[PDB]
Structure 1
Amino acid sequence: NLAPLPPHVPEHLVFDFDMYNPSNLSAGVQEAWAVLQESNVPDLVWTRCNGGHWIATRGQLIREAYEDYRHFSSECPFIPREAGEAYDFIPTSMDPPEQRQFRALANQVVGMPVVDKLENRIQELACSLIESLRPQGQCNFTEDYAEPFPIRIFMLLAGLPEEDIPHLKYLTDQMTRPDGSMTFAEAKEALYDYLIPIIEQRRQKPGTDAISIVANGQVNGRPITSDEAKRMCGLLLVGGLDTVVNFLSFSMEFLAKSPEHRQELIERPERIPAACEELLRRFSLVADGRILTSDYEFHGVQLKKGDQILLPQMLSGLDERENACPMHVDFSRQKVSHTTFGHGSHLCLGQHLARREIIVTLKEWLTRIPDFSIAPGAQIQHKSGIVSGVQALPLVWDPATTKAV
């Protein structure tokens, strides 16, 4: 459905891109979004899809708007409007100054010191999952590794039972790639139905898990409220269940299709961290945005208070104006420019955990299964939304070419 064109929007800026089902999707989701960077498309366009909103199509504008929280507010950060209105996670639904005091608590539970506490378990799980698949000569990568690896690390960190994964993963997916059976508000309320009793249990009887730490936390020296704790835990759950999960599949699909790049990392394993960064650029996958706090002329375009603007994190690094030959993967790329983990005051606090999970996966997969390919006659289908992903990734290999560690 196409929403009526607002009176202030000129026809020449209309480009009806659908972020939940882009027309070029069969080419790959990054490719589908990159249609917005064809030479005839303006830096800033209006789509009538998904209730109507602006889209910044170039890194320069995306960065500028993420920096300018005074004009571009995180209050309503998701499209469609009903989702952005319902979205109340902390700290990502707040602007500075209010936002900042909550970042330290989040950092405590998912940041670098916690990555250190989890290091051995991350390593052990990657190795065990991969060794279990190795002799089979095939896997369904999304279900067999991309999901269980990061999700089990998260459930461990959060002290939540693994048998709760199917329910939580379903709900989280309705917030990022809704199947239409639940509004964002309904999925949010269901997630809160889950979290509220657990938060009170852990305020009564604290453990050492992330939910206990948030629920008993202090925010600039005063106690967090039960409600604030719930809103922070919601963000942590969505980050844990729907980010790295999708990214690993883009990366493994690429490696399955590029024997040369696999060989590069096998021969020169020291390049794996740089490879991770270049894959984070090329297979960037997030697109949220902001709401205008006032009428504002931005790059020659009249924006009105209340207008939503999608600021795709994915697009900055794909912009030829930021990286030459942007669709080409070059592990030796000198300046890897991207906003994959966001930009401005809301830079991802989970990024150290994400990079560890990625780097461990690349190392431990290629150690055991250096030679693999896409299953015979398979056509890999992507999916688009707030976080984009891979529907299924069937891989095959000859077990004789593998190595048990």
Structure 2
Amino acid sequence: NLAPLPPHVPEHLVFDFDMYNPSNLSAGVQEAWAVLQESNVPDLVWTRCNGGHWIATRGQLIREAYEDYRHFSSECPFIPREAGEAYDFIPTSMDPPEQRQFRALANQVVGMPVVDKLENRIQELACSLIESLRPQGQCNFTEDYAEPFPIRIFMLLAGLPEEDIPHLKYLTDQMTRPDGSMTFAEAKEALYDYLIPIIEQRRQKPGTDAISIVANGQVNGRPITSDEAKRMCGLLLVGGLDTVVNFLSFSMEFLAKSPEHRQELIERPERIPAACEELLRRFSLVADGRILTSDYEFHGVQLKKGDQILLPQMLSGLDERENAAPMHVDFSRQKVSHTTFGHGSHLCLGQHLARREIIVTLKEWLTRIPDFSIAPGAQIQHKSGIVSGVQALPLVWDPATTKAV
């Protein structure tokens, strides 16, 4: 359905982009969004899809809106409006100033010093998954490596038992891959039902895991509440799953299809960190947004209080104004500009953990299974949304060209 054009929106700014089903998704999801950057498209447009909303199409405006939390609030960060409204995760549904110290607390459990300590456990996990796949000469990468990898890292961080993985995967999938059978609010309650008792337990008998640290933390000069701890834990769990799963999948699809780029990393593994950054730019995948706190004129366009604006993190690095020949992958790009991990006060806290997951995966995969392809006859299908992704990724290789390391 197209929503009726609100009378403050001029007709020349209307471009009916559907973020959940863009036209020619078949060409690749990044390509499908990049239609918003063709020369006849304004910097700021209105779509009548999904209830109707603004979209900033260029890196400059995306960055500016993410900086201006006074006008562009995270209270309602999702399209459609109803999903944005039910959402109470911390710190993502909060604005500064209140967000600041909640962010600080979350940083204790996923920040840089935690990542340095986790490095080897990440590597051991990646090695075990890859070795289990290696002799088979095939996998669905998305299902067989990408899905099991970040959830296992979360269990380690949060001191949760291995036996809980399938149940927790079921609860998270319900929420982030909705099939229309339940509202966000319903899926959130089912997730909270799992987390609530564990938080109770760890406030009574705290350990040294991430949930204990969060649930017993201090925020704005007082103890965190049980409610706030649950809202934080929900985000700590969800934030590192679909992003990492889908990003690894885009990266491995590209490498399967590009033996010349693959060969570059096989011959020069020291370039893998730079390659990781270039892939983060080219296969950027997140698109959330904000809600107007007041009427506001922004780059010559009148916005009204309560309008939603999609600010696609994906688009900044694809903008030719930010990076020349933006669809071309070059691992030696001198200045790799992107907002893949967002921008402003909510810039991803898990970005350091994410880069280690990516670099460790690429280094270990390329060492053990250097030569692989898309399965004969397969066509890769993408999906579009708040976190865009890969539906399935069938890969094949000759086990004789691999090595058990």
Shorter-chain TM band: over 0.9
CA distance, structure 1, for counterparts of residue 68 and residue 119 of structure 2: 36
Cα distance in 2 for partners of 1:207, 1:303 equals: 48
* Residues 320, 357 of structure 1: alpha-carbon distance in 2 compared, 3 angstrom cutoff: same
- Going from structure 1 to structure 2, the CA distance change for 1:235 and 1:176 (only over 3 Å counts) comes to same
Q: Is the 8 A contact 1:174 1:183 kept in 2?
A: no
Cα pair 1:134 1:369 within 8 Å, conserved: yes
* Residue ranges of structure 2 left out of the alignment (5+ in a row): none
Q: CA–CA distance in 1 between the matches of 2:292 and 2:207?
A: 41
Question: In angstroms, what is the RMSD of aligned CA positions?
Answer: 1.2
Tell me if the contact between 1:253 and 1:393 (Cα under 8 Å) persists in the aligned partners: yes
Provide Cα deviations, 1:24-66, integer angstroms capped at 9, x if missing partner: 2111111111111111111111111111111101101000000
Q: Between 200-209 and 378-387, report the one with greater CA deviation.
A: 200-209
1:162: Cα distance to partner? Answer: 3.5
- Residues 219-244 of structure 1, C-alpha deviations (whole Å, 9 max, x = no match): 24421111111111111111132211
Question: After the TM superposition, which of the residue ranges 84-93 and 109-118 deviates more from structure 2?
Answer: 109-118
Residues in 2 aligned to 1:227 and 1:209: alpha-carbon distance in whole angstroms? 18
**Structure 1 unmatched runs, 5+:** none
Cα distance in 2 between the residues matched to 1:171 and 1:22: 27
SS of the residue aligned with 1:55?
strand
The CA deviation at 1:120 is 1.5
SS in 1 for 2:352: helix
Distance 1:321 1:173, change over 3 A: farther
Secondary structure, counterpart of 1:45 in structure 2: strand
Using the TM superposition, give the Cα deviation of residue 268 of structure 1 relative to its aligned residue in structure 2, in angstroms.
Answer: 0.9
- Aligned ranges for residues 170-185 of structure 1 at < 5 Å? 170-185=170-185
Deviation at 1:167, TM superposition (A): 3.9
CA distance in 1, matches of 2:53, 2:19: 11
Asked if 1:80 corresponds to 2:69, the answer is no
Compared with structure 1, are the counterparts of its residues 163 and 390 closer, same or farther at alpha carbon in structure 2 (3 Å cutoff)?
Answer: farther
| Equivalent-residue separation in structure 1 for 2:19 and 2:172 (angstroms) | 18
| Contact 1:150–1:244 (CA under 8 A) maintained in structure 2 | yes
1:164 Cα shift? 3.4
Query: For the Cα contact (< 8 Å) 2:294–2:306, is it kept in 1?
Result: yes
Q: Label 1:395 to 1:28 Cα distance change in 2 as closer, same or farther (>3 A).
A: same
SS in 2 for 1:125: helix
Q: Would the alpha carbon gap of residues 47 and 165 (structure 1) be closer, same or farther in structure 2, given more than 3 Å must change?
A: farther
* TM-aligned CA deviation for residue 186 of structure 1: 1.2
3-state DSSP of counterpart to 2:385: coil
Using structure 1 for the length normalisation, give the TM-score: 0.98
Question: Shift in Å at residue 163 of structure 1?
Answer: 3.9
- 1:240-293 alpha-carbon deviations (Å, 9 max, x no partner): 322111110000000000111111111111111000000000000100000000
Quote the offset at 1:390 in angstroms.
0.6
Q: How many residues align?
A: 405
The Cα shift of 1:169 comes to 3.2
In structure 2, distance between residues paired with 1:16 and 1:84: 20
Q: How does 1:322-341 map to 2 (within 5 A)?
A: 322-341=322-341
Q: CA deviation at 1:217?
A: 0.9
TM-score, normalised to structure 2, is: 0.98
C-alpha contact (below 8 Å) 2:250/2:389 kept by paired residues: yes
